[PDB]
Amino acid sequence: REIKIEGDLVLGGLFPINEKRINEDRGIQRLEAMLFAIDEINKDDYLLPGVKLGVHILDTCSRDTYALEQSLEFVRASLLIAGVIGGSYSSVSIQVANLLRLFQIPQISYASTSAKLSDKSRYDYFARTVPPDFYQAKAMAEILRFFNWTYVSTVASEGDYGETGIEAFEQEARLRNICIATAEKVGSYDSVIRELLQKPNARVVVLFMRSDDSRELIAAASRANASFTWVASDGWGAQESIIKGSEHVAYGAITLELASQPVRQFDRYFQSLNPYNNHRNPWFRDFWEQKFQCSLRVCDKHLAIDSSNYEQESKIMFVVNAVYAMAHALHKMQRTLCPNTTKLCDAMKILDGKKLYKDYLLKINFTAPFNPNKDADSIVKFDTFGDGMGRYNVFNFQNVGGKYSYLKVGHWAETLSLDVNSIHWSRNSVPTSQCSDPCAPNEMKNMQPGDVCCWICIPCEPYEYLADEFTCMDCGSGQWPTADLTGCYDLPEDYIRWEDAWAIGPVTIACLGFMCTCMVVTVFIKHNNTPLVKASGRELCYILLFGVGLSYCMTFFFIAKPSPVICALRRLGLGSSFAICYSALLTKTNCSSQVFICLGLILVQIVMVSVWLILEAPGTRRYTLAEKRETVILKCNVKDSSMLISLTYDVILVILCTVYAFPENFNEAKFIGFTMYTTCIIWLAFLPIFYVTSSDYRVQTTTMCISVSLSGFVVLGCLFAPK
Amino acid sequence: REIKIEGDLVLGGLFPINEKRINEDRGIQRLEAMLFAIDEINKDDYLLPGVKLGVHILDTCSRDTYALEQSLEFVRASLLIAGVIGGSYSSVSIQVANLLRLFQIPQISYASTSAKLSDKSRYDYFARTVPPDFYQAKAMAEILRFFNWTYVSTVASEGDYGETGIEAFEQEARLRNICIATAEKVGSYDSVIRELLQKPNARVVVLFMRSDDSRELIAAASRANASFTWVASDGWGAQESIIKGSEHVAYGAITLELASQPVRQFDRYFQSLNPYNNHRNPWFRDFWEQKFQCSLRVCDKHLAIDSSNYEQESKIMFVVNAVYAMAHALHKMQRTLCPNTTKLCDAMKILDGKKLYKDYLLKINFTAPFNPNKDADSIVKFDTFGDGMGRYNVFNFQNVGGKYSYLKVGHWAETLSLDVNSIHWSRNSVPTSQCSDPCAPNEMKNMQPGDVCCWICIPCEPYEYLADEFTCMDCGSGQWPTADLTGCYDLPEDYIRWEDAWAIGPVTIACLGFMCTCMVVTVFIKHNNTPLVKASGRELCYILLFGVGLSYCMTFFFIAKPSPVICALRRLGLGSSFAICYSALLTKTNCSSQVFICLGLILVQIVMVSVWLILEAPGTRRYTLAEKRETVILKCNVKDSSMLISLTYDVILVILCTVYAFPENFNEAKFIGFTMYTTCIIWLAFLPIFYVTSSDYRVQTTTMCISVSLSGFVVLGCLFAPK
Ligand SMILES: N[C@](CC1c2ccccc2Oc2ccccc21)(C(=O)O)[C@H]1C[C@@H]1C(=O)O
Ligand SMILES: N[C@](CC1c2ccccc2Oc2ccccc21)(C(=O)O)[C@H]1C[C@@H]1C(=O)O
Ligand SMILES: *[C@@H]1O[C@H](CO)[C@@H](O)[C@H](O)[C@H]1NC(C)=O
Ligand SMILES: *[C@@H]1O[C@H](CO)[C@@H](O)[C@H](O)[C@H]1NC(C)=O
C-alpha cells in the first residue's frame, strides 16, 4: 500500500512505518509531519504560488532489500519525481543513494547521521540536514582540552557506530596532545571494567557506545562499586532509562544530544487526528488500533490525541526543516529559469537534476520557520559536502537533592561555550586525571616506564649536563656544568700562587739568604791577600758565594707559575744546587794546591748531563690533575718516583760525607766539618715530608729556606771574627 | 525489439548493434557468435547435461543512458537472470556495474579494457576476460629497459585513454630509472612536433594515443620531414590505414596488439546464414540490407556469405571464451551443491549470486575450446581482481623490399621474449638515445644544466677531492689528494737534510775547523810561561780556542732537523758566535793589565740578554710553509726581518773595528789587525746571499765554514813560528 496525490510537481518520501507492528514513535510521528509541512507550502503566497505541491511516499520497512524493490516505483517514470526525501536509517539511505545517483535525482535525508555518506565523490546527489558523526569526536575532544584532562581511557562499541567514531577520535586526539591509554571493544562484560582499573591515574572515560551496550557496562560497574567521571557520546543522550538501574555510579557524567526545539504548531495539528477525519493515510486505521489497544474489544468514541499520550519526537524539526530545503531551491528555479510567470513554464519538463543539486540547492541559505527570535541560530546552511551545521547540547547530571535528573549547562556550535559551575563529579573537584606533570631542569632525566605520555623525571648528576630531553651525560672531565645544561661550560683549573698566604715566605727568605749573601760580598771578596784566602781556601769559596743566593732563590723560579718552559727550567734546576752549591762544597774537603781547582770540575760535571738523561723523553710539560669530580689542579709532568729521583737519589751524597768529614788534619772540622750533617738534616729529616704532601705549599720552600739559612754561616760565620 | 529463449536458467547479454545504422563490424559479428557459443553448450554431454541454457540479449545502442533504461528489464524478475554477459564499450560497462552490483548478479564483459573497472571495492561483481590498460605501461616499460633506452619523450592523447595510461607510465618509469623528457598532450597540430625537436638527443617517442589522433600527428611529422623510432600503444595496433598516408616516416616503429587466434569453426558457421534459415534474430533482416546495399533495388537469390566479405573480428575469441567462464562455474554448482543428480535441484531457485562470484567463478581454471596444441597458453585464469592474463604481440615494421607491411617479431606474457634481429630503425642501428654517459672519477664534478638525468661531468682540480657525487672541494692545505678522492690523505712535509748532498760539508768543515782546533790545543795550552803568554796575551786566547770549534759547529746544531726545542737552541745560538768568538776578540784590542780580563765581560754581556729580548714573544716554533699547491716545506718561526735582525744588526760591529783596528802600538796590526776585515768579508760579502736564497743549503753553512777557516789561523798562524 502507498499514497500518491498529484500536483504541478511532486516529492517523494521513505519512512520506516513497519518493523521486522507499526513503529509508532519513529514512524507515523514523522510521516504525518511531512504531510503537515506540505499543507503549509500549498497555502503560503510568499512561497511557490502556482507550483501546487503533491507527494508520493512509500513505506521503507526498515530493511535495505525492501527499499530497493520499493524504490524502483520512483524511477519508473523516466507520477514523475523531482527528488526523494528521506532515508531514515543509515543502512537504508545508502541503498537509495546508489540508485538515485544513476538517474540524476537529488536526495535529502532528514536524520541519517553516518560518516560514509559524506564521501561526495561516491554519493554525489546527497544532502542531509543533520550533522554527521565526525562532529562528535570534535566536541569530546574540545571539552577535554578545556578542562586540561590529557590522559583518558576510551571504550568503543562493536559494529559500525564505534569503529568509525573512535578511529575518528584518535585522529582528533593527536591534534591537541590528548593521548589515550586503553581502548577496549565491547562486543567481555565484567572484564572491560577489570581492564579499566589497571591504570588508576585515568579518571575520565570517553564512552563512545550505543544505547543498549551502555546499560550492560553501567550495570556491571555498579556491581563492582567503582567510580569515574564519564564523558559519553550520543548513545547516552538524555535517555532516562539508562540511570534507573544505578542512580549513584553514573552521577556526575556529562553527555551530548542533538539540539532541537520542538515545533509548536505541529502539536496543535497532530492532536486533532481522529480516524474519521483522516481519509488520506492508509496506515492511520492500523496505528490507531495499536497505541490504543482497541480493535475498530471496542473503541471509545470519546478517545482522542490528548497531551498525556503524544509527547512528540526529537527529530521533527529535521523534517519540517528539510522539506523547506526543497521548497526554496525549487522556488529559485521558477523565478530564475522562467521569470515573468507563476505557473510551471515549458522549460520545466526537462527538470535538470544535475543543474539543480550542484548549483542552487547546495548553496542555499534561509531562515527556519515556526521559530521566534529569528536569525539567532535558525538558518539552514549546507556545507561543501551536503551536511548541515552541527549544534549540540551538553547535558550534565546535577543530582539536586531528591531525585537524580538531567540538566543543561550549555552547548557548542564552533566554540564550546559552557557555564563553568557544574563539575559535580566526585565530591566537588576538577578531576584532573593527568599523569606525571612536567618538571624542572634539575630533575631533567625524563624516562618513561613503557607507557607513553607519563614518565618519571629524576635528577641526574651535578657533574652531568642535560644532553637531550630524555638523555643526560657528563659535562666533561675538565668541563664544569653550568645552569644552561645543554651547553654547559669548561672547568676553571688551579695553579695560582700569587700571595696565597705563602709567597711572602721566599721574599723574606731572600731577605735572609740573598740579603746576607751581600754580607758574604762584604768580607770574602774584600781581601784577596789575607791569610784567610791562603791554602785554607777562600777563593774557592766564591762558589759558595755563587750558591749563597741561587739556593736562596731556587724555589723563586719554581713556585711562581708552571708555564711549560718556565717550570722545565726548575725541572732542570735541581742539579745546580745538587753539585755546585753542595757537592762542590763536598769534593774539595778531602783535606794538589796549585792545580787544586781543576780536580773539582773533574767530578762536578758527572751529573750535569745526567739531569738531561732523565730529561731525554719526559720534560717541558705541565699537565693537569683532578680527583674528586669538582676539584682540578695544574701540576707538572712528574711522578712520585721521578720526584724521589730528584730527592732520594741526590740524598745518597750524605753517605759520601759520613767518613769523608771526620794527611791534612787542620782547623776545618770545627766549622766546615760542622755543616756536614747539620745542613743535611734539612735533607735527612725532610725525606718523608714530601711523601705525605699533595698541596705542596710550605714544603715548596722548606727544602731550601732553612738549608740556605744554614748556608748564611757555613763558613762565613767562622769567617766573621776579623773585618 | 529483443530476443529471449527460455530454458533451465538463462544468460543475458548487451551488444552494440546500433549506432548514434547497424554497426556491422563490432555488432552482429559479436552477437551471432554468442548464440553459436550457446548451441555448443546445449549439445555437449561433457558439459552441463540437464541445465538447458537459453538467452535473453538486448541492444545496448552504444550510449550509457540507453543501457540503464534497457538494463532494468534484467532486474525486474527479482525470465529470471543468472548473470549478464558483456558490456562492450568502457562507458557502457560502468553503468551496468553500478546497477548489477545492487542486486547480487555477476557480470562478465568480453572486451571492456579500462583501469577504473579493476577497483574491486567499488565494482564488486565484475570479471572480464581482456587485460586492462595498466598492462600496457608494463610492456612499453620493459622493451625500453631491454634495449637500454633511458631517455624518451612521450606524447599522450586527451580524454580518458591517455591521462590514465601515461599517468600509469610514469609510475612504472621511475621503477627502472627510465626518466622521461617532455610530455605534450594533443587535444596543437604542428607544435607538438615542434616541441619534439628541441631535445634532439631523444630518438624514441612513446606514443600513447588513439587511432584517430595518431593520424594527424604522423601526417604532420611527414610534413616536416623529421624521423624517429616510435614505440606506440594499442592505438596504432596493426591497423594498415595509418601508414598509407606516409609510408616512409613511420618506417621502423614497433607497436603492440591484443593477441587472439581466430576461431576456426565459427567461420564455418557464420558463413552459412541466409535470411530465410535464420528465423531467430530480429536484426538479421536489417543487417542483410546494409552489407549488401539491397532492399529485401532487389536482392539476388545467389548471394551468400563467402570468404571475400566476412573477415572475422579480432575479438571473437573473447566472447566464445568468456561465455565458457559461466558455463564452467555453473557446472561446478550443480555438481557440488546438489550432487547425485543432473537436473536443477530444489536448492537452485535461491541462486546465491554472492556465493557464486566470490567463491567458485573467480577461482576457476580451464582450457580454452577450439584450439589445437592444448595447455600451451589456452588456459583462462582470473587474477585476484577479475582481469584475465595479458598476452600481447609485438609488431615490427620490416619494409621488405617492395611494400611496407607489418611483421610479428615476438610477444610477451610476463617476460619479454623477442627475436632480436629486427631493429630496422634508421639504417641499421640500436638507436641508443641516452644522454651524457657515466664517467670516470677523474671527471667527477657531475653537474646538470637544468634538465634532469643528463649532465656534464668535468675534471675538477688535482689538488681537490671528490666530496659528493655532485660536489668536490680541496683535499686541504697540508692534505694531498689520493686516488680515493672521498677521503684523500694528508700531505708529506719536507725538512730532510740527512745527506742531501750537503751534510758532508760541515763534517769536513769540522775536520778543518775542529780538527785544527786541536792544533790550537797543541801549542797554545802547552806553554803558560812563554813570552807569548805575556802582556802580548795568550791566556786571553783560550776564548779564541773555545770559539775555534763552536764556530766550526754552529750550523752542526742548526742544519740537523728543526725540532721545536732543538732549533730554538740555534735560534738562541747566534749570540755566542756574535760576542765571545767575535766581539770578545773585538773588545780586548783597544791596545789595565792585571785586571785586563774583567773589562771585557763588562761589555760582553750587553747582548747576552738581548737575544732573550727578541725571544720574549716569538720562539721555540717550527711552523711549515707551502706555496705552489703541491710543494710544502718545514721551516722555523723566522721572518726575513728577524733573520736580518740576527744578520744585519750584528753586522754593525764591523763599524766598531774600522777605526778600532788601525798608546799601545806594537806587533798586533800585522796578524790580529789583518783579520779585522778579511774575516769580516765572510760577513760583508754574504749579506745579500741570504736575501736571494729560499732553499738555504750551501748558505746554511757558508756563513760559518769559510769564516772558521779564517779562525784556524787568526792568531795561531802567527803563533806557528815556534814549537
Ligand atoms: N540516524 C540514526 C543514528 C544511529 C544511532 C543513534 C544513536 C545510537 C545508536 C545509533 O546506531 C547507528 C549506527 C550507525 C549509524 C547511525 C546510527 C540511525 O538509526 O541510523 C538514528 C537517528 C536516526 C533514527 O533512528 O531516527
Ligand atoms: N574496450 C575498447 C577499448 C578502447 C580503445 C581501444 C583502442 C583505441 C582507443 C580506444 O578508446 C578507449 C577509451 C577508453 C577505454 C577503452 C577504449 C572500447 O571501445 O572501449 C575497445 C575494445 C572495445 C571495442 O570497441 O570492441
Ligand atoms: C587548564 O585547564 C583549566 C581548567 O579550568 C584552566 O583553568 C587552566 O587555565 C588551564 N591551564 C592553563 C595553563 O591555562
Ligand atoms: C644494454 O642493452 C643492450 C641492448 O642490446 C644489451 O645488449 C646490453 O647488454 C645492456 N647493457 C648491459 C650493461 O648489460
Author numbering:
A (entry chain B), B (entry chain A): 31 to 50, 59 to 116, 140 to 248, 255 to 363, 371 to 665, 686 to 756, 762 to 822
Paper quotes:
In the structure of antagonist/NAM-bound mGlu3, the two TMDs of mGlu3 underwent a remarkable twist and brought TM3/TM4 helices of both subunits into close proximity. Additional density inside the allosteric pocket of each mGlu3 TMD may correspond to the NAM VU0650786. The mutations W7826.50A and F6523.40A largely impaired the effect of VU0650786 through decreasing its potency (increasing its IC50) by more than 23 fold compared to the wild-type. Comparing the structure of antagonist/NAM-bound mGlu3 with that of antagonist-bound mGlu3 revealed that the inactive VFT regions of both structures showed open conformations. The extracellular tips of the TM4, TM5 and TM6 helices in antagonist/NAM-bound mGlu3 underwent outward shifting due to the binding of the NAM in the TMD. Whereas the TMDs of antagonist-bound mGlu3 were separated, with two TM5 helices in closest proximity, the TMDs of antagonist/NAM-bound mGlu3 underwent a marked conformation twisting and entered into proximity to form a symmetric dimer interface composed of the TM3 and TM4 helices of each subunit. The proximate distance between the TM3 helices in the antagonist/NAM-bound mGlu3 was 11.6 Å (taking Cα of V639 as the reference), and the nearest distance between TM4 helices was 11.4 Å (taking Cα of Q688 as the reference). The antagonist/NAM-bound mGlu3 with the TM3/4–TM3/4 interface in close proximity indicated a fully inactive state of mGlu3. Functional studies also showed that NAM further decreases cAMP inhibition compared to the antagonist alone, confirming that NAM stabilizes the fully inactivate state of mGlu3, likely acting as an inverse agonist. Upon NAM binding, the TMDs undergo a clockwise twist, which results in a closer distance between TM3/TM4 helices from the two subunits, similar as that observed in the antagonist/NAM-bound mGlu2, suggesting a new interface for fully inactive state in mGlu dimers.
